[PDB]
Amino acid sequence: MVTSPALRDVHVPHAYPEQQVDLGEITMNYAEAGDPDRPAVLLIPEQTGSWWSYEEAMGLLSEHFHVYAVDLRGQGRSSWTPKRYSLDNFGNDLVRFIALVVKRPVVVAGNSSGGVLAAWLSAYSMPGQLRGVLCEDPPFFASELVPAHGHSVRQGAGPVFELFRTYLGDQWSVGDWEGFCRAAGASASPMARSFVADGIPQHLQEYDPEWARVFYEGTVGLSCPHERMLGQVKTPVLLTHHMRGIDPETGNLLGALSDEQALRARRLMDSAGVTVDYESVPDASHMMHQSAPARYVEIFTRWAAALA
Amino acid sequence: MVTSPALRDVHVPHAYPEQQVDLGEITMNYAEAGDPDRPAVLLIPEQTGSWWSYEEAMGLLSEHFHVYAVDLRGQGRSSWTPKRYSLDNFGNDLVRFIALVVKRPVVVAGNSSGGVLAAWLSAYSMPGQLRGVLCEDPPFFASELVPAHGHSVRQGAGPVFELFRTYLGDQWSVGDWEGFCRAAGASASPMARSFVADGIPQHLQEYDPEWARVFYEGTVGLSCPHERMLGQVKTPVLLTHHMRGIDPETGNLLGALSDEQALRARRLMDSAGVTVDYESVPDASHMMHQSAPARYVEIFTRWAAALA
């Protein structure tokens, strides 16, 4: 057997056993850590990341919390659903996971697009499902094609998403890794180059690149403008803001969101009447939970421990 | 006080008392009829219709069923949500209503767009929520801007939706009823002229015309192609097909869906592995549950009684 991303037979073992749940349209794959009597935490990966993006952080959080880490649809061992990728479908999948698996109020932490989905749940979950959310370096506004504030996706991560769409393809239908690496290495985007490797990185083998299409094309959030979601949050919010800057050659955003976009997000969430904490860590990498797990967990724990 | 659709102070009493539930993002208004110990039924109105579209049919269905009739978001007394109107948000609202209010498996019946939503639930609800669905004159394919089969919305109901968008406006921000009636009276679409009246009909006063925009502009179902939904239904389906035809002047569809679209929908649901029933009533009006309630209830009851 020659395995392939398109055939979805690429998965490998990890430090925690995996479980699956039927949510109706999809099956969600996930893993669990910690004492089930301790407060529940739901971890949402960044785009291209599976649940095991949190593997090291899970071991540290297990000191105090009952942790669930999930594969979103289009990722990992969860269902791939051509033509169905939207913030509302990702979000409602997570509402169902809470109702069907967790069965208790949760603290949610999500990285990047996962942090956009953490804010989505704060605003749009079923009543009483959430105690608070941590949005770890989220591209508020900057992941939209037509944002209310600041740089668009085409002026931020879009160059990478375009390469994923063109060289990898929906459901890995093209799979031209050599052409991806050629184009990426010649790109003006540093982030594009960070995926260049001899072989396809494991997390990307598990990723449905239709995700990149719906971000690039502005369809993933067409029915979910960020200004309305942010102004309707209903729980405490912790917003962590990592490296960010401007590329001189193009004017494009480096990092997840600009200082302007973070300010506007903070004002909107304040107007919603919730408690907002903002932690600027301008020296931290995008996936702090992976590059500096102890630092991430200390931030999360100090904040979560004071919730309820 | 001069009431106005834009101010949402236009509602009037009906034959059943009204109840409200917080679903999280929205509050949903609904009414209930019948003995709660009898099998549960959920009624979904047509576009521009409130729960009381079913008032007469509810009284007859109360003989054998426990009936819930709902206002969708953007209609009636349920929340209006600018920029959030999509099949997935309407559908997940209904999933939450079943989980939080009904708390038992349901038979779903929906008219027109409501029948599109009934099929949505058959495919995409949470597991075990549904016993079967009735799709009463549903615009499968014909309500999509880019359908896989047959006439597009622009070749069907689009002329009416365009007039709602232009003369009534999102959240009734324009409210030019006189201009609507002038334009509708000169239209080639009989359906358009069917809304012309001296005053605004009560049901339309309760309707958020952003609904019409998202149908006309192809955004309401952008992340929910009908061919994928219909191929993923998981319950028995009854499809009723009322008046339909072709306007010789324009070639446009008259009615909810063509024979070709009904055939393609039936084949897709058959390939999903469910029991499909098809009842053609070519002399029936679009809202049979309103114009011929006894006939509608006989069809529904005969089919529902044979379910489980």
Add this chain to the structure above:
Amino acid sequence: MVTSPALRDVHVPHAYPEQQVDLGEITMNYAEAGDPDRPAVLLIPEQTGSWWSYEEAMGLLSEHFHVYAVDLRGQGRSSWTPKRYSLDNFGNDLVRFIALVVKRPVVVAGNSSGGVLAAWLSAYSMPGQLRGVLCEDPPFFASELVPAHGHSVRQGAGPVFELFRTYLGDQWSVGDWEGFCRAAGASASPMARSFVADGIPQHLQEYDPEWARVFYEGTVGLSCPHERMLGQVKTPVLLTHHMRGIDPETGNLLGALSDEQALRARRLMDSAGVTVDYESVPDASHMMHQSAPARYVEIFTRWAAALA
């Protein structure tokens, strides 16, 4: 030197010498045949076809006409212009070619998309530039994403355009010919399979597949609805209608346009006040000028000879 479509060094000699003209934004490549004192004819190829699609027909037409055959932008040796492909840019290129090279009124004949452009010139050229147009098997309506009448591109040639977009790519940026042939051979579209070959056909090597993208995505004609263009033609029109049918498995259109779309196009052009000739040749292939050159030239000549 290893030549490549993306490097645009693939061209070969043909039976006529080639010439180039600066039209401003682009350089147009073309070839000329016949006695320059005889009536001028401009030949527009089908999509993926270069000027030499007409090579055999040119020799026959030279008996009576002064023939120019052109490469459109994105084709052949004419400029490739990323992000600029639209009916209005193709059309205005041709207006400039007439004004700068031909310098006399012309009879225009175009195949498929070239026939759409022949109708465009009939409606939208500069005054007095045209004596008449032949639209050879044109996808009126059927090449639009949202047509006023009949099947959309997604229900016609779209499956082929999708494969060109995904496996060949804008400006041949992907160039996965093996993957194209694999996907095409498994396609339900007979036309997709007609491009399958051991090596890339010469005409396709010269083609910028961004053309297929703008057709598939509905941008090429977004500012040029066919119902308005057809109702504004200003010259005699000959419309030839070749093989057409319906695929039983999918309901999709086979051929360039349906009988319904041809009828509606004929009515619109009649309403414009012009002379319309309609030649149904239901046994002819799509590129009659190439598969049956003598038959094509006899049709063109009988009609052109009676113009002016």
Add this chain to the structure above:
Amino acid sequence: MVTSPALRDVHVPHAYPEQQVDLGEITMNYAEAGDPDRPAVLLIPEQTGSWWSYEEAMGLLSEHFHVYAVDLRGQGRSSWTPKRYSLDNFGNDLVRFIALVVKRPVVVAGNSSGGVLAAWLSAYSMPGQLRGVLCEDPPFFASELVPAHGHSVRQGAGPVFELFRTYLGDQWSVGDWEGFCRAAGASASPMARSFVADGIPQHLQEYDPEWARVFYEGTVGLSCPHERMLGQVKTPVLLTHHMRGIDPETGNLLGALSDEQALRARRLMDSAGVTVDYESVPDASHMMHQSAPARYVEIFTRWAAALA
């Protein structure tokens, strides 16, 4: 007779007589000033402006130049063309006007969208038609829905265009001036409030508000990205940059383009190899040719005199 913008019977006399030319698809209305033997100048108004936007500046320019001022399609007495409004159609109209009416090389000056069109001609006219262009406060990038650099239209003039689309409507099909003024008066955009008046201003009565739609919806320039146009200019360019700033409440752009967008435009034109002049007049109103005609003409003349 009760005149109405929708009926296009609202025009009035001006200080110069008006002339019309058939350009093919459209008829273009224009006025002429000065000695025909002097160097030719073509004046392009701002959006919502007719040729007589330049009436005072024409009288001063007549001292040294032969001046043509035009109504674009969708404005003034030139044809209204539903569904056809795009930069490429406006631009090719102007190419035809130069070829059919002026018949000599021209210096072009255009305000706002007209300055976008002046750059369009510099890049895309027929060869030899232009000696140079002046772009008077042009919304480079800022009038695009998805620009390569800086604020989008939704973050700039979009609020005004949205009000034109909703309360005036395509071809003045809604015509709700009272509702426009109510909405415009409550808007955050000063530019919106600048159109509020007891009666409809004369220039707006001549304007087809479908213009506003195609700017707001991102279709007018979909096939004409500004970064490609600006990188392909072929004549000297003068860019005047008037009042601009940031609204602290919203973050939105005030004025035609930001400093960042002006810089990126200058660099692109420099890379095209032309002479670029940039005149910042940060105290000037948007239509300097109207509010300070003598200053506008001094800038234009000083620069034009140094051309050829």
